[PDB]
Amino acid sequence: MDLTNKNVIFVAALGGIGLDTSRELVKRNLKNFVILDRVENPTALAELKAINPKVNITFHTYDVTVPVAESKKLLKKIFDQLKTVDILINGAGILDDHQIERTIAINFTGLVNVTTAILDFWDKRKGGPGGIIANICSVTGFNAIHQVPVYSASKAAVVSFTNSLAKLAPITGVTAYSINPGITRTPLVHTFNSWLDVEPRVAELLLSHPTQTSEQCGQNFVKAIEANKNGAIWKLDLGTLEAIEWTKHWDSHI
Amino acid sequence: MDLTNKNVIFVAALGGIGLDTSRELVKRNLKNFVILDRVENPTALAELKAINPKVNITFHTYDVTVPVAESKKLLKKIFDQLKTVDILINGAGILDDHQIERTIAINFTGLVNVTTAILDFWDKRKGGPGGIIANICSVTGFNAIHQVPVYSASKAAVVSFTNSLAKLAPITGVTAYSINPGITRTPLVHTFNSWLDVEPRVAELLLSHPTQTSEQCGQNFVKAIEANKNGAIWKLDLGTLEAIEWTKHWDSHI
Ligand SMILES: NC(=O)c1ccc[n+]([C@@H]2O[C@H](COP(=O)([O-])OP(=O)(O)OC[C@H]3O[C@@H](n4cnc5c(N)ncnc54)[C@H](O)[C@@H]3O)[C@@H](O)[C@H]2O)c1
Ligand SMILES: NC(=O)c1ccc[n+]([C@@H]2O[C@H](COP(=O)([O-])OP(=O)(O)OC[C@H]3O[C@@H](n4cnc5c(N)ncnc54)[C@H](O)[C@@H]3O)[C@@H](O)[C@H]2O)c1
């Protein structure tokens, strides 16, 4: 994948991992870089624009928990302007096992819904050109932080969902891969809530082990995007980039 | 584990797999069998009651998609009468990838929320005796049926969540294991919707391959319950019972 001249939508581009990934993305000569995130960040937006004046950077206020109809409407506006979108990159995520419904709504349901919405424009069965989806999942989707069982379960859901998207590519025209960071120093893991307060010191304990910086994660993230491998399960841990092999425990035969 | 004289709550006891499991359970001489299900089935109720008049069987009309406070209210009703409950079986589930939110709400959020609610009565930190949770997940939670990616992801979530529950047992006193049937002939799989209609013949095709009966499933379900292995991931496929080993791709080190 050559990012020169591509159009990219990045949901949650201005978070910890998001901003460092965006800093790296705009170093490529993208045609359009469209940011979809909850809250504006003027400072971050100005910096990205400064990194590469050749890229047209736009921002839209966006919340993944809205109905699928509301997402399509935003996407229509974007596709109407750009005519083509090359990549959708999802990053939306919260870590707070006190908020059960909201964790599931954001990390799992919202991702499925944005995907379902963009399929309206990309599905080759509806006359679409196909597309690429990069989903930020998490190593916790392979093996949980059992102290945040709901967060970890929402991530196991999206690793699975992404794996299925990739297997559906020959039908839909939409390829997909997961981006699964290991522990990364951002405001996500600085202070957080465990389920039923099973471990009030969870953040302190987690961060008392090796971590990577969001800078290292961002670098490997854009590397994974350029590799552009349908069905890849990328592990971005301790500053390395590594594809993992999913174990075959069962098969539907279809 | 000896089921004799035990008090059991079975969410969704009267469906395909549920009824044949419920038959095998009542033959094991339970003291009380508490059924929580979305709709009444007087025929099934009458029959179960007759299989062992010794066993005290009650029924509550219950929908897993209510808030945790509502669930806690019903459980207080039940605990106040029974004093003790030994085992909770969470068996509620739908298969319909035209219903994204509801699939997720029922198969994932609902299971987490009943678990969360009962923990208020069982958590050893709260003066409770601990307990046992048996979660009906699915082989699709290991490897998807990719034509029902939402269903399969919702199952990957509960496999993970159950794995984490088990690891939290030294803290909460509540042990847990997953029951993962392979394809089993019930009203669930008679016919059903694929996501975005990617495969309109998904049921026809799936059912042209080997299956098991709900009777085979139910017999192996009680066998695993009697085995009482914390953190077990039981595969109940093609009339067999099998413990599978989860791959270690990553470690939180905590
Ligand atoms: N930090 C880590 O160690 C780590 C590890 C593995 C995976 N992840 C995942 O990477 C992603 C980014 O996390 P981060 O560490 O940069 O945390 P962060 O809190 O700094 O950023 C989270 C991002 O998600 C966005 N977001 C949250 N709720 C949203 C909503 N309702 N609608 C739209 N956007 C929303 C935020 O606005 C922000 O852009 C998340 O999916 C997270 O689960 C993080
Ligand atoms: N049949 C299979 O091949 C298969 C394979 C793996 C896992 N499973 C799982 O086994 C469980 C039972 O499925 P089944 O095959 O007996 O199908 P089924 O449709 O016969 O039974 C579904 C059960 O779930 C209950 N339920 C559904 N929605 C509910 C709600 N909102 N609140 C409370 N209860 C609700 C139903 O009343 C019923 O008791 C489900 O979790 C299903 O996902 C089935």
Side-chain angles (χ1 to χ4, degrees), chain B residues 81-118:
Chain B
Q81 299 165 315
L82 294 187
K83 302 307 165 184
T84 51
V85 173
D86 298 287
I87 302 162
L88 168 70
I89 309 169
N90 283 313
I94 63 157
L95 172 59
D96 185 346
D97 263 34
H98 289 193
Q99 297 183 246
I100 288 160
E101 268 82 2
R102 193 92 178 145
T103 290
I104 295 171
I106 294 170
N107 297 358
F108 178 20
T109 314
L111 187 152
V112 174
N113 276 349
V114 188
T115 295
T116 298
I118 203 163

Side-chain angles (χ1 to χ4, degrees), chain A residues 99-112:
Chain A
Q99 300 190 69
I100 296 170
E101 273 82 354
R102 197 159 168 271
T103 286
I104 295 167
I106 294 179
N107 296 4
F108 178 23
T109 313
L111 185 143
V112 174

Side-chain angles (χ1 to χ4, degrees), chain A residues 149-202:
Chain A
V150 184
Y151 176 88
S152 300
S154 70
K155 294 300 183 164
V158 287
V159 171
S160 162
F161 184 76
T162 309
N163 281 168
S164 296
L165 277 178
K167 267 172 191 73
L168 287 173
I171 299 171
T172 55
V174 185
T175 54
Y177 47 83
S178 55
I179 297 291
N180 304 276
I183 308 314
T184 306
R185 302 199 199 262
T186 77
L188 188 81
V189 290
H190 187 253
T191 50
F192 65 93
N193 296 323
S194 68
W195 175 69
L196 300 181
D197 292 328
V198 288
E199 184 50 85
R201 304 194 297 119
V202 60

Side-chain angles (χ1 to χ4, degrees), chain A residues 10-20 35-39 61-66 90-95 102 105-107 111 135-141 145 151 154-155 158 179-190 206-207 211-212 214 217 221 236, chain B residues 250:
Chain A
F10 195 158
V11 170
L14 303 180
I17 289 177
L19 187 48
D20 273 320
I35 294 158
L36 269 53
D37 207 350
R38 274 207 290 216
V39 176
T61 303
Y62 180 65
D63 177 354
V64 292
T65 64
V66 303
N90 303 309
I94 63 152
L95 165 62
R102 197 159 168 271
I106 294 179
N107 296 4
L111 185 143
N135 283 331
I136 305 178
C137 298
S138 172
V139 289
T140 64
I145 299 162
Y151 176 88
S154 70
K155 294 300 183 164
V158 287
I179 297 291
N180 304 276
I183 308 314
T184 306
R185 302 199 199 262
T186 77
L188 188 81
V189 290
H190 187 253
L206 191 66
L207 265 28
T211 67
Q212 70 187 358
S214 47
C217 186
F221 195 153
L236 291 66
Chain B
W250 179 79

Side-chain angles (χ1 to χ4, degrees), chain B residues 83-197:
Chain B
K83 302 307 165 184
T84 51
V85 173
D86 298 287
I87 302 162
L88 168 70
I89 309 169
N90 283 313
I94 63 157
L95 172 59
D96 185 346
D97 263 34
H98 289 193
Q99 297 183 246
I100 288 160
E101 268 82 2
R102 193 92 178 145
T103 290
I104 295 171
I106 294 170
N107 297 358
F108 178 20
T109 314
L111 187 152
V112 174
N113 276 349
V114 188
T115 295
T116 298
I118 203 163
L119 261 282
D120 212 78
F121 300 87
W122 277 348
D123 191 338
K124 80 193 199 175
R125 298 170 305 155
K126 284 194 79 264
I132 302 170
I133 302 174
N135 286 329
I136 305 190
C137 300
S138 170
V139 292
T140 67
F142 317 152
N143 303 96
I145 297 165
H146 58 267
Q147 297 93 342
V148 286
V150 185
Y151 177 84
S152 295
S154 80
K155 295 307 193 160
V158 287
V159 170
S160 166
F161 180 77
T162 309
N163 285 170
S164 295
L165 278 186
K167 291 174 171 92
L168 287 172
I171 293 181
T172 65
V174 179
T175 61
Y177 46 85
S178 55
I179 301 293
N180 305 279
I183 317 298
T184 310
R185 323 209 260 298
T186 72
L188 190 83
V189 296
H190 183 235
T191 188
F192 61 96
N193 295 313
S194 62
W195 176 68
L196 302 186
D197 297 322

Side-chain angles (χ1 to χ4, degrees), chain A:
Chain A
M1 168 66 174
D2 184 0
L3 283 168
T4 307
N5 291 134
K6 300 296 183 287
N7 288 337
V8 177
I9 299 170
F10 195 158
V11 170
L14 303 180
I17 289 177
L19 187 48
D20 273 320
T21 305
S22 301
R23 288 185 180 111
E24 285 292 314
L25 279 167
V26 302
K27 281 175 178 147
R28 286 70 174 171
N29 291 335
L30 297 185
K31 195 169 294 189
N32 290 279
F33 182 48
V34 186
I35 294 158
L36 269 53
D37 207 350
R38 274 207 290 216
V39 176
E40 290 184 32
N41 189 338
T43 296
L45 195 61
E47 180 192 356
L48 288 181
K49 288 184 201 264
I51 295 168
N52 195 342
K54 292 159 274 179
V55 178
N56 195 214
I57 307 187
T58 51
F59 176 87
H60 304 276
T61 303
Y62 180 65
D63 177 354
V64 292
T65 64
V66 303
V68 75
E70 193 179 328
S71 291
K72 293 209 219 305
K73 185 195 85 194
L74 174 59
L75 291 172
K76 184 185 171 263
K77 176 186 174 301
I78 293 159
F79 272 83
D80 280 0
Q81 287 169 139
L82 306 189
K83 311 308 185 188
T84 48
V85 181
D86 299 282
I87 308 169
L88 166 76
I89 307 161
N90 303 309
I94 63 152
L95 165 62
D96 192 341
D97 265 35
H98 290 188
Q99 300 190 69
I100 296 170
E101 273 82 354
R102 197 159 168 271
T103 286
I104 295 167
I106 294 179
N107 296 4
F108 178 23
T109 313
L111 185 143
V112 174
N113 280 347
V114 176
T115 300
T116 303
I118 203 169
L119 260 281
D120 239 58
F121 309 88
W122 278 347
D123 201 319
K124 73 172 173 194
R125 303 171 306 157
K126 296 169 152 178
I132 301 156
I133 297 168
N135 283 331
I136 305 178
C137 298
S138 172
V139 289
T140 64
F142 317 148
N143 298 98
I145 299 162
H146 63 261
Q147 296 95 339
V148 283
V150 184
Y151 176 88
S152 300
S154 70
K155 294 300 183 164
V158 287
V159 171
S160 162
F161 184 76
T162 309
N163 281 168
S164 296
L165 277 178
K167 267 172 191 73
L168 287 173
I171 299 171
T172 55
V174 185
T175 54
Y177 47 83
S178 55
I179 297 291
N180 304 276
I183 308 314
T184 306
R185 302 199 199 262
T186 77
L188 188 81
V189 290
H190 187 253
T191 50
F192 65 93
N193 296 323
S194 68
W195 175 69
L196 300 181
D197 292 328
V198 288
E199 184 50 85
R201 304 194 297 119
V202 60
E204 206 236 326
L205 290 161
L206 191 66
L207 265 28
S208 76
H209 303 271
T211 67
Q212 70 187 358
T213 72
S214 47
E215 290 74 36
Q216 297 174 295
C217 186
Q219 279 157 192
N220 287 324
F221 195 153
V222 180
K223 186 183 173 207
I225 286 168
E226 293 171 332
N228 190 219
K229 310 275 172 173
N230 185 51
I233 312 164
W234 295 110
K235 181 180 72 60
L236 291 66
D237 195 25
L238 311 175
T240 65
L241 179 72
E242 189 175 334
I244 78 143
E245 284 296 281
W246 204 247
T247 315
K248 289 274 197 217
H249 291 284
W250 178 79
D251 174 27
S252 67
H253 308 296
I254 63 166

